[PDB]
From a paper:
C-MET receptor, which belongs to the receptor tyrosine kinase (RTK) family, plays essential roles in controlling a number of critical cellular processes such as cell proliferation, survival, motility, and morphogenesis. C-MET can be activated by its cognate ligand—hepatocyte growth factor (HGF). Structurally, the c-MET receptor is composed of a Semaphorin (SEMA) domain, a plexin-semaphorin-integrin (PSI) domain, and four consecutive immunoglobulin-plexin-transcription factors (IPT1-4) domains in the extracellular region, a single transmembrane helix (TM), and an intracellular KD. HGF, the ligand of c-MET, is secreted as a single chain 83 kDa precursor protein containing an N-terminal (N) domain, four consecutive kringle (K1–K4) domains, and a serine protease homology (SPH) domain.
The entire c-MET I as well as the K4 and SPH domains of HGF I were absent in the reconstruction from the second class (sub-complex), which was resolved at 4 Å resolution. Nevertheless, c-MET II and its bound HGFs, which include N, K1, and K2 domains of HGF I and K4 and SPH domains of HGF II, adopt nearly identical conformation as shown in holo-complex. Distinct to the binding mode between c-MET I and HGF I that involves multiple domains of HGF, only the K1 domain located on the opposite side of HGF I makes direct contact with c-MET II, indicating that HGF-K1 is essential for c-MET activation. In detail, two short loops of HGF I-K1 (residues 154–163; residues 192–192) make numerous contacts with a concave surface formed together by the fourth, fifth, and sixth blades of the c-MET II-SEMA, burying ~1141 Å2 solvent-accessible surface area. In addition, hydrophobic residues from HGF I-K1, such as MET155, Ile156, Pro157, and Pro194, pack tightly against residues Gly334, Tyr369, Phe373, and Ile377 in c-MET II-SEMA. After proteolysis cleavage, the newly formed C-terminus of c-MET α-chain inserts into a small pocket in HGF I-K1, which is mainly stabilized by the electrostatic interaction between Glu302 of c-MET and Arg197 of HGF. Intriguingly, the residues of c-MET II-SEMA that are involved in the binding to HGF I-K1 largely overlap with those at the c-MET I-SEMA/HGF I-K3 interface, suggesting that c-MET-SEMA cannot simultaneously bind to HGF-K1 and K3.
Residue numbers in the entry:
A (entry chain D): 389 to 429, 434 to 469, 495 to 722
B (entry chain E): 26 to 106, 110 to 301, 311 to 626, 634 to 680, 687 to 738
C (entry chain A): 34 to 55, 59 to 290
Write the structure that this text describes.
């Protein structure tokens, strides 16, 4: 019941129930804690109108520790790749009943970034993450293999197809295992910028020994992908589209939750998540991802938990 | 003379030339897509252009060798040892999320499904490129993620959730089929994005009837559709595992690919009034017209479920050929799921949980407080208090079996494309307000109408409805297939205005043809077929039957029999209510013209007689008294007697008369008095 | 045409009613006319369940609301003479009771009545527009067909479609002391199923008694009493045929 006002203050929301199912708490203690914590710059007691005028819109506080706050639900307005010669740290191998299902990105010492599509079950007694691996089964190496349980799942905004999962315990960070930074809030990529995907997936090989496979790529404008897709894509703000030039090579099954990492200026940085769409690896057809930039702030607010 | 004037009733059987396409084999499913209309049929798939139904192209999934060891989509033509079975398509869907493809889903070949790809320049050429969808399940070969569709009966519904083509499929299962190769009663399939298989995302994603109730408790699904982030299903099945008696059921769950999470069955019944109709025959989901919106209380934009029920042969599934159609505003049924039924109407679900097993000893239902949050201890619930509806036609179809239905809107009215068991295709302006007579009731074909129909509605003024009967696919313009068939003025004026035509003095006719300029659609003249009798004595106020039509005044449905009067000369004959119908009049009052006045107009008819009776001659004159002889009379509704005893008329005429004389214990002669409702002039004496 | 109804109306004089938070007036000589205007089907664009006359102002005002509603104020305006319709205040049945308008929304078995506006859970409920005038309100149970069984309603409870509200006669709380003239009651039901004649009016049958000349013997509305001590109560009839008839009342004890 909201349109054209993504800013909280414009919407006096008369509702008291979050996305998950937990009722909002007494706003005043939250105002104390937030004024201590959040530094944006008298809003109602215990109604999910968001004070902070956040990008994603109205949101509410919850008492429970594991979920301090969440949105109250309202309407609003790799195939043909190369093996990697060297061990890599951002890669997170997600393991479901003791086999790989998706790749993920390592953000902090206890936090990984993946896609909603990759969580068939919500259960955590079964998921198990590995870090620091060169072979999808680990037969290649084990020194850098880090086995961790999964502590908790946090879903993105509605319509995000984006998810974070937080670990039972932290990890030791060394050369073998590495994290990656995040974009600036509006960090907008130059057109024709080169950057690559790393994947663990189907790869279109009669046999794949289990090396993680790298595929280069170039960012294209949303307009160019509208042309190639012939109106089959209705492009929204949050997506990016980067497409292989003159060759059909792209991520496919198993690569969901994979990172689009790109080098901006001097260092390399993540920009996207590999998510399924539009088909697989069609020659002279681009690829479509979700831009972390539209959600980086939300990542920050949640990572403050 | 009600029979004779039945020519007023519309000619139920008139023949129409409509674009008619015929196939070599029965047609099961049909899909409309991008100016082509594909058909699945026994051993075949066809593609059709619309406006002509020219078979532009075809692709041949003919008979297949079924041999036990031959794998499904490996090629075993070389095998010489084992039967040339045939396939019948049961699922034909179109996908365009990935690429413009068609998916066919065969019967015999283990129920493994295949794809056809549309080239960019030319779309009809489906034969050029074909794959199979077969993934050897190396991990767990024990289960089939790719053995999709059963044989006995199935419904398949495609959807795109989460950038994910999901097939929600229901199967009918015979006990024999399982141990060879498993199947499932309701299941959710992800298509692997590389388009070479399906995966079951979780053991939780399917529901199969427990091993013991396979042979008993067969469920056959009849319709499947999506709305409001829920995927409903409509099926038919036993009231209880040992009830040996049936009703329709509805299935609800939301559309998380992980599995069927909030799985709720409810009984659905439509009654008449308290006679219930058990079995559903077909259904169609549509939006309602303005008139019906209030009349069932639904908003103009809400989805609506139309279902035609047939009453069953008791303790059996076979329809009894007594039917109804009933409307279920989806908000109401969804509400029933959420709020109305209280706690202890709910139960566990028999065929899956098994009647005796731990959970449904006790479980809380987060039924109101939660709407399909994917929990761990999801509870599949079987309700017991059927959602009762009442008929929309008030049982005007109580004797004729309905088999296929569709609905579109037009102006503010909403129309139904009904179809019966013997191949008659009606169209009715449906409203609870008035019993409305079909404006098209032609006979289509000898075979029953298939439930699979398509209606396409371009620019709200040009549309059409493909319907399938036996081996025939036909295009009907919904715009009013005609109005030539109407012959009774009242019928001409009741035909809904969207078909522009009105009465011109002799027959319902399109406006711009008959020249007289008498073409009218609002007021029109009463008419008389005949009058019985036309011979009336001066004193005789006698019963005159009047055969005609349009004897009622108009009210859009209710035909006002009170604005009627009869004028004879100057006096008005005595008009009696209980025997005056828009069909006929029954009144009781020198050739004279009778005039009949109605609330619209009046009719003159030129020949009624106040004939003056004449009697002149009698036979015999002198004779005995035995009382068994034959009297003959002559001159110009009567009776005749002598001495208090009626002589039976041995012969009747205006100019000849014959009685058999009463026996009278007397030997003299009597003047015999005619009693034509009245003692008119007696004759003379005859010697007894 | 010219037909009387005011027997049905309820009389209280030298009083007035106002509802300050909202009525049609026309130049009428007799309260009898405005009363008939009310009673007759669709007589007035608004559904008047009351009205006041004053002979002095030569004007009549009609209320689509009785004193039973909230927001009404009762005052001593002596010239004004109220007119209620006892049908609402009845809290009785009368035979089939086709014209029952009372505010009972509960059934014999104690399950709530479905509103006649809401199609859930039961659908044979289109009647609010089907039958004009039968005062089928939000929820209260009536007899729109005048069907014999009594005022029935649809239950919110899904299983049972309709159940008839049990509702009393007027007779069950009415007794008669052996004389009857001492009894000062509320019935208007003869033995032949006819309603009494108005005492104050003398039309059509012309009778000797007027309430003003015999006050405190309660010749009010049309209430069968014993004006001269007959064993059981009686009145003159509206009926042109029968002059006068008794009224049958049961006896009480203790």
């Amino acid at each position: 019941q909201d349109c054209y006002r993504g800013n909280g203050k414009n919407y006096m929301g008369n509702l008291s129930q979050t996305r998950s199912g937990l009722t909002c708490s007494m706003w005043d203690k939250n105002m104390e804690d937030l004024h201590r914590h959040i530094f944006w710059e008298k809003l109602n007691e215990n109604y999910c109108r968001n004070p902070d005028d956040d990008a994603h819109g109205p949101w509410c506080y919850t008492g429970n520790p594991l979920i301090p706050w969440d949105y109250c639900p309202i309407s609003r307005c790799v195939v043909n790749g190369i093996p990697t010669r060297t061990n890599i740290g951002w890669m997170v191998s997600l393991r479901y009943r003791n086999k790989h299902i998706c790749g993920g990105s390592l953000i902090k010492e206890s936090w990984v970034l993946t896609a909603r599509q990759c969580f068939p079950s919500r259960d955590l007694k079964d998921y198990e993450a590995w870090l620091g691996i060169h072979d999808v089964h680990g037969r290649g190496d084990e020194k850098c293999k880090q086995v961790l349980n999964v502590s908790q799942l946090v879903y993105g905004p509605e319509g995000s197809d984006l998810v974070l999962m937080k670990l039972a315990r932290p990890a030791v960070l060394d050369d073998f295992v590495s994290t990656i930074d995040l974009p600036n809030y509006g960090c907008t990529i130059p057109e024709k910028t080169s950057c690559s995907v790393y994947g663990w997936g189907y790869t279109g090989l009669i046999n794949y020994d289990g090396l993680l496979r790298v595929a280069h790529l170039y960012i294209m404008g949303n307009e160019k992908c509208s042309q190639h897709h012939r109106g089959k894509v209705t492009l929204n703000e949050s997506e990016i589209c980067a497409g292989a030039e003159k060759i059909g090579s792209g991520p496919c099954e198993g690569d969901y939750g994979g990172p689009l990492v790109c080098e901006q200026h001097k260092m390399r940085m993540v920009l996207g998540v590999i998510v399924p769409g539009r088909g697989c690896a069609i020659p002279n057809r681009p690829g479509i991802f979700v831009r972390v930039a539209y959600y980086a702030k939300w990542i920050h607010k949640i990572i403050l938990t | 003379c009600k029979e004779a004037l039945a020519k007023s009733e519309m000619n139920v059987n008139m023949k129409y030339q409509l674009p008619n396409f015929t196939a070599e084999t029965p047609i099961q499913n049909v899909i409309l897509h991008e100016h082509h209309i594909f058909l699945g049929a026994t051993n075949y798939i066809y593609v059709l252009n619309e406006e002509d139904l020219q078979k532009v192209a075809e692709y041949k999934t003919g008979p297949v060798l079924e041999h036990p060891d031959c794998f499904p989509c490996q090629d075993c033509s070389s095998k010489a040892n084992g039967v040339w079975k045939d396939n019948i398509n049961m699922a034909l869907v179109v996908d365009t999320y990935y690429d413009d493809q068609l998916i066919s889903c065969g019967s015999v070949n283990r129920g493994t499904c295949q794809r056809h790809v549309f080239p960019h320049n030319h779309t009809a050429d489906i034969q050029s490129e074909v794959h199979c969808i077969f993934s050897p399940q190396i991990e767990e070969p024990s289960q089939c993620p790719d053995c999709v569709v059963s044989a006995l009966g199935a419904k398949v519904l495609s959807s795109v959730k989460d950038r994910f083509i999901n097939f929600f499929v229901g199967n009918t299962i015979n006990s024999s089929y399982f141990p060879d190769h498993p199947l499932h009663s309701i299941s959710v399939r992800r298509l692997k994005e590389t388009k070479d298989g399906f995966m079951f995302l979780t053991d939780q994603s399917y529901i199969d009837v427990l091993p013991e109730f396979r042979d008993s408790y067969p469920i056959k699904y009849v319709h499947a559709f999506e709305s409001n982030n829920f995927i409903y299903f409509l099926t038919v099945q036993r009231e209880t595992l040992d009830a040996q008696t049936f009703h329709t059921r509805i299935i609800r769950f939301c559309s998380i690919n992980s599995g069927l999470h909030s799985y709720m069955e409810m009984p659905l019944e439509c009654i008449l009034t308290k006679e219930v109709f058990n079995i559903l025959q077909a259904a169609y989901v549509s939006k309602p017209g303005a008139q019906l919106a209030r009349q069932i209380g639904a908003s103009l934009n809400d989805d609506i479920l139309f279902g035609v029920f047939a009453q069953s042969k008791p303790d059996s599934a076979e329809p009894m050929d007594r039917s109804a159609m009933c409307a279920f505003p989806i908000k109401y049924v969804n509400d029933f799921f959420n709020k109305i039924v209280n706690k202890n109407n709910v139960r566990c679900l028999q065929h899956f949980y098994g009647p005796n097993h731990e959970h449904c000893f006790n479980r809380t239902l987060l039924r109101n407080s939660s709407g399909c949050e994917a929990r761990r201890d999801e509870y599949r619930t079987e309700f017991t208090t059927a959602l009762q509806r009442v008929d929309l036609f008030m049982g005007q179809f109580s004797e004729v079996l309905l088999t296929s239905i569709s609905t579109f809107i037009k102006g503010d009215l909403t129309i139904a494309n009904l179809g019966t068991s013997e191949g008659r295709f009606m169209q009715v302006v449906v409203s609870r307000s008035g019993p409305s007579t079909p404006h098209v009731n032609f006979l289509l074909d000898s075979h029953p109408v298939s439930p699979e129909v398509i209606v396409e509605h371009t620019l709200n003024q040009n549309g059409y409805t493909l319907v399938i009967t036996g081996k025939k696919i036909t295009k009907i313009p919904l715009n009013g297939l005609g109005c030539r068939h109407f012959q009774s003025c009242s019928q001409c004026l009741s035909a809904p205005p969207f078909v522009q035509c009105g009465w011109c003095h002799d027959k319902c006719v399109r406006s711009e043809e008959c020249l007289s300029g008498t073409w009218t659609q609002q007021i029109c003249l009463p008419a008389i077929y005949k009058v019985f009798p036309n011979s009336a004595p001066l004193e005789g106020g006698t019963r005159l039957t009047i055969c005609g039509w349009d004897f009622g005044f108009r009210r859009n449905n209710k035909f006002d029999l009170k604005k009627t009067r009869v004028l004879l000369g100057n006096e008005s004959c005595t008009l009696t209510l209980s025997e005056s119908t828009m069909n006929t009049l029954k009144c009781t009052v020198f050739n004279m013209s009778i005039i009949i006045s109605n609330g619209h107009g009046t009719t003159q008819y030129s020949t009624f007689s106040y004939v003056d009776p004449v009697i002149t001659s009698i036979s015999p004159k002198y004779g005995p008294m035995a009382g068994g002889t034959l009297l003959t009379l002559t001159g110009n509704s009567r009776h005749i007697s002598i001495g208090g005893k009626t002589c039976t008329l041995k012969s009747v005429s205006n100019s000849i008369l014959e009685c058999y004389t009463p026996a009278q214990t007397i030997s003299t002669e009597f003047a015999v008095k005619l009693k034509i409702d009245l003692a008119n002039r007696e004759t003379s004496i005859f010697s007894y």
